Amino acid sequence: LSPQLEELITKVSKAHQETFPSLCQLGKYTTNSSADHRVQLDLGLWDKFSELATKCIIKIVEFAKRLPGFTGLSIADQITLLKAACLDILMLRICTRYTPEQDTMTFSDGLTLNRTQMHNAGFGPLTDLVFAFAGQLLPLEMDDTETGLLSAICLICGDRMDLEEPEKVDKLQEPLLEALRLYARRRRPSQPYMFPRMLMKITDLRGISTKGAERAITLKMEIPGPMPPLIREMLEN
Ligand SMILES: CC1(C)CCC(C)(C)c2cc([C@H](O)C(=O)Nc3ccc(C(=O)O)cc3F)ccc21
């Protein structure tokens, strides 16, 4: 029935808005750490960054638990899905927080870092790609509910590796794909290419993620002391 899809659109949307505050509703603030020029790594900036990344991972898990059906999956699958799609969601999240005019990216507590600071915070040689990915996301003018659905689709993925019940995860994903097409087309009937442009983004996203995992390999050498435990859980993929 249609009322069940509208119900799913509503739940996913609320689940996202509650685990991911919008840019416009955020109390933006700045820091003066290494804003001047690019350096290998500003450690004070990386502590605050890892701290925020860990908080986001928890918010991602929180969001995943509110997605209809996820909890019914085996606990092994739930972990497997999160493990595989966490960086992807993480990348999509910070990218929806791009303010093109100031050329900054805002975090959930309001920390607003300019490109130089993002670089010095840990992004390193991947900074510019991330920023270019966020740029090219702007033209799609997605909203909170579309980002939420898109994020769910990245998560509920049957093609993952150690799934015990891949066939069940595929069925869970089915309505999210219907839900997103129904929603995207209704909001904007004049641009029928939004849905397929959104799905194709999942591929782009997945790519900026493998580069991000790759960047975490290097970073581990540059930082004094082990990377946070939840961040490490995610990278063990
Ligand atoms: C694996 C690890 C720790 C090292 C490699 C790089 C620097 C590439 C990276 C990049 C990201 C991600 O792109 C991001 O910043 N997401 C992000 C999104 C939202 C918030 C928030 O709203 O608070 C915080 C974030 F952290 C996350 C992890 C990592």
PDB file of C-alpha atoms and ligand atoms in Angstrom:
ATOM      1  CA  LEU A   1       0.000   0.000   0.000  1.00  0.00           C
ATOM      2  CA  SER A   2       0.926   3.668  -0.526  1.00  0.00           C
ATOM      3  CA  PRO A   3       0.221   4.718   3.093  1.00  0.00           C
ATOM      4  CA  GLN A   4       3.053   2.397   4.201  1.00  0.00           C
ATOM      5  CA  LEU A   5       5.526   4.056   1.838  1.00  0.00           C
ATOM      6  CA  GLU A   6       4.483   7.506   2.998  1.00  0.00           C
ATOM      7  CA  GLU A   7       4.987   6.157   6.511  1.00  0.00           C
ATOM      8  CA  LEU A   8       8.515   4.976   5.585  1.00  0.00           C
ATOM      9  CA  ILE A   9       9.353   8.333   4.046  1.00  0.00           C
ATOM     10  CA  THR A  10       8.270   9.994   7.244  1.00  0.00           C
ATOM     11  CA  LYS A  11      10.205   7.678   9.611  1.00  0.00           C
ATOM     12  CA  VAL A  12      13.484   7.707   7.694  1.00  0.00           C
ATOM     13  CA  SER A  13      13.268  11.483   7.321  1.00  0.00           C
ATOM     14  CA  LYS A  14      12.667  12.059  11.064  1.00  0.00           C
ATOM     15  CA  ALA A  15      15.347   9.492  11.900  1.00  0.00           C
ATOM     16  CA  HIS A  16      17.862  11.497   9.894  1.00  0.00           C
ATOM     17  CA  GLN A  17      16.851  14.952  11.160  1.00  0.00           C
ATOM     18  CA  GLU A  18      17.183  13.670  14.708  1.00  0.00           C
ATOM     19  CA  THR A  19      20.651  12.175  14.230  1.00  0.00           C
ATOM     20  CA  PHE A  20      21.880  14.884  11.860  1.00  0.00           C
ATOM     21  CA  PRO A  21      21.074  18.567  12.519  1.00  0.00           C
ATOM     22  CA  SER A  22      20.781  20.738   9.414  1.00  0.00           C
ATOM     23  CA  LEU A  23      23.384  23.325   8.460  1.00  0.00           C
ATOM     24  CA  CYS A  24      20.932  26.209   8.770  1.00  0.00           C
ATOM     25  CA  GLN A  25      19.802  25.167  12.246  1.00  0.00           C
ATOM     26  CA  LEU A  26      23.362  24.931  13.562  1.00  0.00           C
ATOM     27  CA  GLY A  27      25.233  27.260  15.900  1.00  0.00           C
ATOM     28  CA  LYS A  28      28.317  27.844  13.751  1.00  0.00           C
ATOM     29  CA  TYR A  29      31.598  28.816  15.416  1.00  0.00           C
ATOM     30  CA  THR A  30      35.254  28.893  14.366  1.00  0.00           C
ATOM     31  CA  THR A  31      38.806  28.198  15.554  1.00  0.00           C
ATOM     32  CA  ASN A  32      42.049  29.991  14.753  1.00  0.00           C
ATOM     33  CA  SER A  33      44.132  26.838  14.583  1.00  0.00           C
ATOM     34  CA  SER A  34      46.272  26.488  11.449  1.00  0.00           C
ATOM     35  CA  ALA A  35      43.970  28.617   9.277  1.00  0.00           C
ATOM     36  CA  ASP A  36      46.940  30.393   7.607  1.00  0.00           C
ATOM     37  CA  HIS A  37      48.488  27.747   5.331  1.00  0.00           C
ATOM     38  CA  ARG A  38      48.683  23.977   4.786  1.00  0.00           C
ATOM     39  CA  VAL A  39      50.823  21.811   7.042  1.00  0.00           C
ATOM     40  CA  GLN A  40      51.091  18.021   7.472  1.00  0.00           C
ATOM     41  CA  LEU A  41      48.916  17.816  10.594  1.00  0.00           C
ATOM     42  CA  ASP A  42      47.594  20.098  13.284  1.00  0.00           C
ATOM     43  CA  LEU A  43      47.161  17.777  16.300  1.00  0.00           C
ATOM     44  CA  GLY A  44      44.777  19.950  18.284  1.00  0.00           C
ATOM     45  CA  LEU A  45      42.587  20.102  15.195  1.00  0.00           C
ATOM     46  CA  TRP A  46      42.792  16.308  14.735  1.00  0.00           C
ATOM     47  CA  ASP A  47      41.723  15.673  18.339  1.00  0.00           C
ATOM     48  CA  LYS A  48      38.653  17.776  17.892  1.00  0.00           C
ATOM     49  CA  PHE A  49      38.013  16.185  14.506  1.00  0.00           C
ATOM     50  CA  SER A  50      38.292  12.565  15.615  1.00  0.00           C
ATOM     51  CA  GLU A  51      36.091  13.453  18.586  1.00  0.00           C
ATOM     52  CA  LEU A  52      33.398  14.708  16.193  1.00  0.00           C
ATOM     53  CA  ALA A  53      33.808  11.787  13.766  1.00  0.00           C
ATOM     54  CA  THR A  54      33.281   9.324  16.621  1.00  0.00           C
ATOM     55  CA  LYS A  55      30.153  11.204  17.663  1.00  0.00           C
ATOM     56  CA  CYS A  56      28.839  10.990  14.119  1.00  0.00           C
ATOM     57  CA  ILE A  57      29.450   7.251  13.932  1.00  0.00           C
ATOM     58  CA  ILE A  58      27.249   6.841  17.005  1.00  0.00           C
ATOM     59  CA  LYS A  59      24.623   9.018  15.366  1.00  0.00           C
ATOM     60  CA  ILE A  60      24.829   6.871  12.251  1.00  0.00           C
ATOM     61  CA  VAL A  61      24.283   3.675  14.263  1.00  0.00           C
ATOM     62  CA  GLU A  62      21.437   5.474  16.068  1.00  0.00           C
ATOM     63  CA  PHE A  63      19.852   6.340  12.680  1.00  0.00           C
ATOM     64  CA  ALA A  64      20.331   2.801  11.359  1.00  0.00           C
ATOM     65  CA  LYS A  65      18.449   1.412  14.345  1.00  0.00           C
ATOM     66  CA  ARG A  66      15.420   3.629  13.528  1.00  0.00           C
ATOM     67  CA  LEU A  67      15.254   2.437   9.911  1.00  0.00           C
ATOM     68  CA  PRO A  68      12.386  -0.071   9.647  1.00  0.00           C
ATOM     69  CA  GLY A  69      13.640  -3.641   9.589  1.00  0.00           C
ATOM     70  CA  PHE A  70      17.311  -3.071  10.405  1.00  0.00           C
ATOM     71  CA  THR A  71      16.844  -4.333  13.972  1.00  0.00           C
ATOM     72  CA  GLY A  72      15.157  -7.520  12.680  1.00  0.00           C
ATOM     73  CA  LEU A  73      18.344  -8.364  10.812  1.00  0.00           C
ATOM     74  CA  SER A  74      20.870 -10.604  12.619  1.00  0.00           C
ATOM     75  CA  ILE A  75      23.149  -8.687  14.924  1.00  0.00           C
ATOM     76  CA  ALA A  76      26.030  -9.891  12.737  1.00  0.00           C
ATOM     77  CA  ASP A  77      24.427  -8.328   9.646  1.00  0.00           C
ATOM     78  CA  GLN A  78      23.660  -5.127  11.442  1.00  0.00           C
ATOM     79  CA  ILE A  79      27.334  -4.770  12.326  1.00  0.00           C
ATOM     80  CA  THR A  80      28.450  -5.835   8.856  1.00  0.00           C
ATOM     81  CA  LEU A  81      26.246  -3.211   7.185  1.00  0.00           C
ATOM     82  CA  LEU A  82      27.401  -0.437   9.505  1.00  0.00           C
ATOM     83  CA  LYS A  83      31.019  -1.471   9.110  1.00  0.00           C
ATOM     84  CA  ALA A  84      30.825  -1.326   5.327  1.00  0.00           C
ATOM     85  CA  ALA A  85      28.707   1.831   4.904  1.00  0.00           C
ATOM     86  CA  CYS A  86      29.762   4.036   7.790  1.00  0.00           C
ATOM     87  CA  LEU A  87      32.471   6.000   6.026  1.00  0.00           C
ATOM     88  CA  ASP A  88      30.120   6.424   3.052  1.00  0.00           C
ATOM     89  CA  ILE A  89      27.433   8.014   5.186  1.00  0.00           C
ATOM     90  CA  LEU A  90      30.135   9.987   7.015  1.00  0.00           C
ATOM     91  CA  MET A  91      31.339  11.429   3.684  1.00  0.00           C
ATOM     92  CA  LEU A  92      27.825  12.221   2.487  1.00  0.00           C
ATOM     93  CA  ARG A  93      27.073  13.902   5.831  1.00  0.00           C
ATOM     94  CA  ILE A  94      29.939  16.377   5.946  1.00  0.00           C
ATOM     95  CA  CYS A  95      29.352  17.118   2.269  1.00  0.00           C
ATOM     96  CA  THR A  96      25.774  18.253   2.855  1.00  0.00           C
ATOM     97  CA  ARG A  97      27.377  20.697   5.356  1.00  0.00           C
ATOM     98  CA  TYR A  98      29.288  22.627   2.672  1.00  0.00           C
ATOM     99  CA  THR A  99      28.822  26.374   2.487  1.00  0.00           C
ATOM    100  CA  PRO A 100      30.173  27.274  -0.977  1.00  0.00           C
ATOM    101  CA  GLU A 101      30.585  31.028  -0.270  1.00  0.00           C
ATOM    102  CA  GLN A 102      32.749  30.687   2.831  1.00  0.00           C
ATOM    103  CA  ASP A 103      34.335  27.484   1.396  1.00  0.00           C
ATOM    104  CA  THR A 104      33.953  25.729   4.686  1.00  0.00           C
ATOM    105  CA  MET A 105      32.377  22.584   6.089  1.00  0.00           C
ATOM    106  CA  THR A 106      30.401  22.563   9.337  1.00  0.00           C
ATOM    107  CA  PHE A 107      30.351  19.826  11.960  1.00  0.00           C
ATOM    108  CA  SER A 108      27.536  18.866  14.333  1.00  0.00           C
ATOM    109  CA  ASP A 109      28.581  20.918  17.331  1.00  0.00           C
ATOM    110  CA  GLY A 110      28.876  23.905  15.015  1.00  0.00           C
ATOM    111  CA  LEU A 111      32.643  23.781  14.312  1.00  0.00           C
ATOM    112  CA  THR A 112      33.033  25.444  10.914  1.00  0.00           C
ATOM    113  CA  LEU A 113      36.413  24.658   9.302  1.00  0.00           C
ATOM    114  CA  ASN A 114      37.796  26.370   6.195  1.00  0.00           C
ATOM    115  CA  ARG A 115      39.569  24.210   3.602  1.00  0.00           C
ATOM    116  CA  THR A 116      42.999  24.767   5.104  1.00  0.00           C
ATOM    117  CA  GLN A 117      41.805  23.622   8.525  1.00  0.00           C
ATOM    118  CA  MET A 118      40.040  20.529   7.134  1.00  0.00           C
ATOM    119  CA  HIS A 119      43.366  19.646   5.488  1.00  0.00           C
ATOM    120  CA  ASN A 120      45.341  20.213   8.687  1.00  0.00           C
ATOM    121  CA  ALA A 121      42.693  18.413  10.747  1.00  0.00           C
ATOM    122  CA  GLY A 122      43.476  15.155   8.968  1.00  0.00           C
ATOM    123  CA  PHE A 123      42.071  15.293   5.431  1.00  0.00           C
ATOM    124  CA  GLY A 124      45.543  15.799   3.976  1.00  0.00           C
ATOM    125  CA  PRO A 125      45.867  15.098   0.219  1.00  0.00           C
ATOM    126  CA  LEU A 126      42.157  14.152   0.052  1.00  0.00           C
ATOM    127  CA  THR A 127      40.868  17.591   1.143  1.00  0.00           C
ATOM    128  CA  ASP A 128      40.348  18.962  -2.355  1.00  0.00           C
ATOM    129  CA  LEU A 129      38.501  15.882  -3.624  1.00  0.00           C
ATOM    130  CA  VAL A 130      36.142  15.901  -0.672  1.00  0.00           C
ATOM    131  CA  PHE A 131      35.473  19.561  -1.333  1.00  0.00           C
ATOM    132  CA  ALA A 132      34.940  18.914  -5.036  1.00  0.00           C
ATOM    133  CA  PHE A 133      32.580  16.065  -4.239  1.00  0.00           C
ATOM    134  CA  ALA A 134      30.557  18.374  -2.009  1.00  0.00           C
ATOM    135  CA  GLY A 135      30.561  21.001  -4.684  1.00  0.00           C
ATOM    136  CA  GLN A 136      29.194  18.659  -7.327  1.00  0.00           C
ATOM    137  CA  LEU A 137      26.511  17.564  -4.834  1.00  0.00           C
ATOM    138  CA  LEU A 138      25.080  21.098  -4.622  1.00  0.00           C
ATOM    139  CA  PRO A 139      23.412  21.123  -8.112  1.00  0.00           C
ATOM    140  CA  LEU A 140      21.191  18.224  -7.005  1.00  0.00           C
ATOM    141  CA  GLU A 141      19.737  20.522  -4.270  1.00  0.00           C
ATOM    142  CA  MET A 142      18.750  17.512  -2.125  1.00  0.00           C
ATOM    143  CA  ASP A 143      16.844  17.956   1.098  1.00  0.00           C
ATOM    144  CA  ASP A 144      16.899  16.332   4.538  1.00  0.00           C
ATOM    145  CA  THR A 145      14.510  13.520   3.620  1.00  0.00           C
ATOM    146  CA  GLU A 146      16.333  12.726   0.351  1.00  0.00           C
ATOM    147  CA  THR A 147      19.718  12.631   2.134  1.00  0.00           C
ATOM    148  CA  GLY A 148      18.193  10.375   4.778  1.00  0.00           C
ATOM    149  CA  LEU A 149      16.693   7.955   2.249  1.00  0.00           C
ATOM    150  CA  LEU A 150      19.894   8.028   0.179  1.00  0.00           C
ATOM    151  CA  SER A 151      21.882   7.241   3.348  1.00  0.00           C
ATOM    152  CA  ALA A 152      19.566   4.308   4.188  1.00  0.00           C
ATOM    153  CA  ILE A 153      20.054   2.926   0.707  1.00  0.00           C
ATOM    154  CA  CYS A 154      23.824   3.077   1.165  1.00  0.00           C
ATOM    155  CA  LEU A 155      23.405   1.171   4.418  1.00  0.00           C
ATOM    156  CA  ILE A 156      20.793  -1.461   3.582  1.00  0.00           C
ATOM    157  CA  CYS A 157      22.861  -3.104   0.887  1.00  0.00           C
ATOM    158  CA  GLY A 158      22.678  -6.789   0.042  1.00  0.00           C
ATOM    159  CA  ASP A 159      25.879  -6.886  -1.960  1.00  0.00           C
ATOM    160  CA  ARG A 160      28.032  -6.662   1.169  1.00  0.00           C
ATOM    161  CA  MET A 161      30.517  -9.424   1.991  1.00  0.00           C
ATOM    162  CA  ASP A 162      29.818 -11.280   5.216  1.00  0.00           C
ATOM    163  CA  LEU A 163      26.060 -11.059   5.151  1.00  0.00           C
ATOM    164  CA  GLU A 164      24.396 -14.140   6.574  1.00  0.00           C
ATOM    165  CA  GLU A 165      21.069 -13.176   5.040  1.00  0.00           C
ATOM    166  CA  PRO A 166      21.732 -11.046   1.919  1.00  0.00           C
ATOM    167  CA  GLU A 167      18.296 -11.795   0.446  1.00  0.00           C
ATOM    168  CA  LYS A 168      16.585 -10.196   3.461  1.00  0.00           C
ATOM    169  CA  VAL A 169      18.635  -7.021   3.304  1.00  0.00           C
ATOM    170  CA  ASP A 170      17.706  -6.654  -0.399  1.00  0.00           C
ATOM    171  CA  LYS A 171      13.990  -6.765   0.515  1.00  0.00           C
ATOM    172  CA  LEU A 172      14.524  -4.081   3.161  1.00  0.00           C
ATOM    173  CA  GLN A 173      16.193  -1.892   0.594  1.00  0.00           C
ATOM    174  CA  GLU A 174      13.396  -2.327  -1.948  1.00  0.00           C
ATOM    175  CA  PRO A 175      10.913   0.114  -0.307  1.00  0.00           C
ATOM    176  CA  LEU A 176      13.658   2.712   0.277  1.00  0.00           C
ATOM    177  CA  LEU A 177      14.318   2.796  -3.461  1.00  0.00           C
ATOM    178  CA  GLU A 178      10.552   3.089  -4.168  1.00  0.00           C
ATOM    179  CA  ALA A 179      10.241   5.672  -1.399  1.00  0.00           C
ATOM    180  CA  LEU A 180      13.057   7.817  -2.792  1.00  0.00           C
ATOM    181  CA  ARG A 181      11.753   7.786  -6.369  1.00  0.00           C
ATOM    182  CA  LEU A 182       8.209   8.587  -5.193  1.00  0.00           C
ATOM    183  CA  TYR A 183       9.537  11.445  -3.052  1.00  0.00           C
ATOM    184  CA  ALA A 184      12.079  12.935  -5.487  1.00  0.00           C
ATOM    185  CA  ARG A 185       9.640  13.026  -8.408  1.00  0.00           C
ATOM    186  CA  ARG A 186       6.787  14.544  -6.400  1.00  0.00           C
ATOM    187  CA  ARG A 187       8.943  17.305  -4.920  1.00  0.00           C
ATOM    188  CA  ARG A 188      10.318  18.153  -8.334  1.00  0.00           C
ATOM    189  CA  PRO A 189       8.405  16.700 -11.342  1.00  0.00           C
ATOM    190  CA  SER A 190      10.323  19.017 -13.688  1.00  0.00           C
ATOM    191  CA  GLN A 191      13.620  17.167 -13.281  1.00  0.00           C
ATOM    192  CA  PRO A 192      13.080  13.404 -13.787  1.00  0.00           C
ATOM    193  CA  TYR A 193      16.797  12.764 -13.714  1.00  0.00           C
ATOM    194  CA  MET A 194      17.143  13.450  -9.981  1.00  0.00           C
ATOM    195  CA  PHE A 195      16.540   9.906  -8.749  1.00  0.00           C
ATOM    196  CA  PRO A 196      19.042   8.188 -11.121  1.00  0.00           C
ATOM    197  CA  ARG A 197      21.494  11.047 -10.375  1.00  0.00           C
ATOM    198  CA  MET A 198      21.089  10.272  -6.662  1.00  0.00           C
ATOM    199  CA  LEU A 199      21.669   6.547  -7.012  1.00  0.00           C
ATOM    200  CA  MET A 200      24.732   7.144  -9.198  1.00  0.00           C
ATOM    201  CA  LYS A 201      26.049   9.343  -6.376  1.00  0.00           C
ATOM    202  CA  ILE A 202      26.269   6.205  -4.225  1.00  0.00           C
ATOM    203  CA  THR A 203      29.049   5.021  -6.547  1.00  0.00           C
ATOM    204  CA  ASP A 204      30.915   8.365  -6.353  1.00  0.00           C
ATOM    205  CA  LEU A 205      30.448   8.335  -2.583  1.00  0.00           C
ATOM    206  CA  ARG A 206      31.768   4.782  -2.289  1.00  0.00           C
ATOM    207  CA  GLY A 207      34.867   5.962  -4.164  1.00  0.00           C
ATOM    208  CA  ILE A 208      35.599   9.001  -2.039  1.00  0.00           C
ATOM    209  CA  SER A 209      35.246   6.494   0.876  1.00  0.00           C
ATOM    210  CA  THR A 210      37.882   3.990  -0.263  1.00  0.00           C
ATOM    211  CA  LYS A 211      40.179   6.981  -0.731  1.00  0.00           C
ATOM    212  CA  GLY A 212      39.243   8.038   2.838  1.00  0.00           C
ATOM    213  CA  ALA A 213      40.123   4.609   4.203  1.00  0.00           C
ATOM    214  CA  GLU A 214      43.323   4.884   2.211  1.00  0.00           C
ATOM    215  CA  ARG A 215      43.946   8.248   3.813  1.00  0.00           C
ATOM    216  CA  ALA A 216      43.413   6.733   7.266  1.00  0.00           C
ATOM    217  CA  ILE A 217      46.314   4.345   6.588  1.00  0.00           C
ATOM    218  CA  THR A 218      48.716   7.272   6.146  1.00  0.00           C
ATOM    219  CA  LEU A 219      47.197   9.298   8.978  1.00  0.00           C
ATOM    220  CA  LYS A 220      47.921   6.485  11.452  1.00  0.00           C
ATOM    221  CA  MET A 221      51.617   7.162  10.953  1.00  0.00           C
ATOM    222  CA  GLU A 222      51.260  10.935  11.308  1.00  0.00           C
ATOM    223  CA  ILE A 223      49.288  10.836  14.556  1.00  0.00           C
ATOM    224  CA  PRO A 224      50.855  10.075  17.967  1.00  0.00           C
ATOM    225  CA  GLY A 225      48.798   7.343  19.571  1.00  0.00           C
ATOM    226  CA  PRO A 226      46.041   5.069  18.176  1.00  0.00           C
ATOM    227  CA  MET A 227      43.050   6.450  16.277  1.00  0.00           C
ATOM    228  CA  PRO A 228      39.774   6.322  18.300  1.00  0.00           C
ATOM    229  CA  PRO A 229      38.187   2.816  18.775  1.00  0.00           C
ATOM    230  CA  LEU A 230      34.883   3.462  16.913  1.00  0.00           C
ATOM    231  CA  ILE A 231      36.814   4.966  14.043  1.00  0.00           C
ATOM    232  CA  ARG A 232      38.992   1.858  14.023  1.00  0.00           C
ATOM    233  CA  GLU A 233      35.895  -0.430  14.132  1.00  0.00           C
ATOM    234  CA  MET A 234      34.725   1.283  10.974  1.00  0.00           C
ATOM    235  CA  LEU A 235      38.042   0.997   9.148  1.00  0.00           C
ATOM    236  CA  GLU A 236      38.261  -2.728   9.874  1.00  0.00           C
ATOM    237  CA  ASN A 237      36.269  -3.503   6.733  1.00  0.00           C
TER     238      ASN A 237
HETATM  239  C1  LIG B   1      38.617   7.671   8.801  1.00  0.00           C
HETATM  240  C2  LIG B   1      38.871   9.113   9.256  1.00  0.00           C
HETATM  241  C3  LIG B   1      38.865   9.263  10.838  1.00  0.00           C
HETATM  242  C4  LIG B   1      40.271   9.540   8.733  1.00  0.00           C
HETATM  243  C5  LIG B   1      40.331   9.887   7.205  1.00  0.00           C
HETATM  244  C6  LIG B   1      39.490  11.169   6.852  1.00  0.00           C
HETATM  245  C7  LIG B   1      40.252  12.465   7.354  1.00  0.00           C
HETATM  246  C8  LIG B   1      39.442  11.277   5.282  1.00  0.00           C
HETATM  247  C9  LIG B   1      38.059  10.982   7.507  1.00  0.00           C
HETATM  248  C10 LIG B   1      36.933  11.715   7.032  1.00  0.00           C
HETATM  249  C11 LIG B   1      35.638  11.597   7.583  1.00  0.00           C
HETATM  250  C12 LIG B   1      34.338  12.169   7.031  1.00  0.00           C
HETATM  251  O1  LIG B   1      34.408  12.647   5.750  1.00  0.00           O
HETATM  252  C13 LIG B   1      33.779  13.307   7.969  1.00  0.00           C
HETATM  253  O2  LIG B   1      34.398  14.307   8.324  1.00  0.00           O
HETATM  254  N1  LIG B   1      32.544  13.063   8.362  1.00  0.00           N
HETATM  255  C14 LIG B   1      31.906  13.717   9.326  1.00  0.00           C
HETATM  256  C15 LIG B   1      30.595  14.068   9.081  1.00  0.00           C
HETATM  257  C16 LIG B   1      29.854  14.720  10.018  1.00  0.00           C
HETATM  258  C17 LIG B   1      30.406  15.072  11.209  1.00  0.00           C
HETATM  259  C18 LIG B   1      29.625  15.872  12.116  1.00  0.00           C
HETATM  260  O3  LIG B   1      28.572  16.451  11.777  1.00  0.00           O
HETATM  261  O4  LIG B   1      30.136  16.045  13.233  1.00  0.00           O
HETATM  262  C19 LIG B   1      31.725  14.686  11.501  1.00  0.00           C
HETATM  263  C20 LIG B   1      32.453  13.983  10.567  1.00  0.00           C
HETATM  264  F1  LIG B   1      33.614  13.395  10.912  1.00  0.00           F
HETATM  265  C21 LIG B   1      35.497  10.777   8.675  1.00  0.00           C
HETATM  266  C22 LIG B   1      36.524   9.950   9.096  1.00  0.00           C
HETATM  267  C23 LIG B   1      37.819  10.029   8.580  1.00  0.00           C
END
